[PDB]
Amino acid sequence: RNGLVVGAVQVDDCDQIMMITDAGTLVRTRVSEISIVGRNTQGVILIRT
């Protein structure tokens, strides 16, 4: 897509754990995973960084 290019990382997570992500240019963040709903292997949703 215009926004999405290449799949990067896959992490298994429960419904109350956080996902910390990093960017190549000295940027990161810590997000709560409650606010995103599972979907069936075909879709694009929420931009977190």
Place this chain on the structure above:
DNA sequence: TTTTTTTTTTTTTTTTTTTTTTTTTTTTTTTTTTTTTTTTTTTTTTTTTTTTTTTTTTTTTTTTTTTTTTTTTTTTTTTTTTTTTTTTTTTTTTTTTTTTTTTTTTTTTTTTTTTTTT
């Protein structure tokens, strides 16, 4: 009374060795130069309610090319042996403790003599 044999330290100066003055190469050391950390404030970035039109997932059906599949023969895997490196017992050496045995040096002050340089 004269004359004859032998012994060594010196005229020794030259060969060998030792001692004493020298200066190339890898290991220290002071300097400048580049990586780190803490404050001000500062426009600037960034967190969080509300509305909104959107664009991707889930009713239902289709196929085809990746999922089925069996089998030959390779070739990575494992076995034994031996070498290289790592790591730890073993040994050796050295240092400190407190009473003993031994020693060794640097300068002032004056006055007189040797001992070199000009």
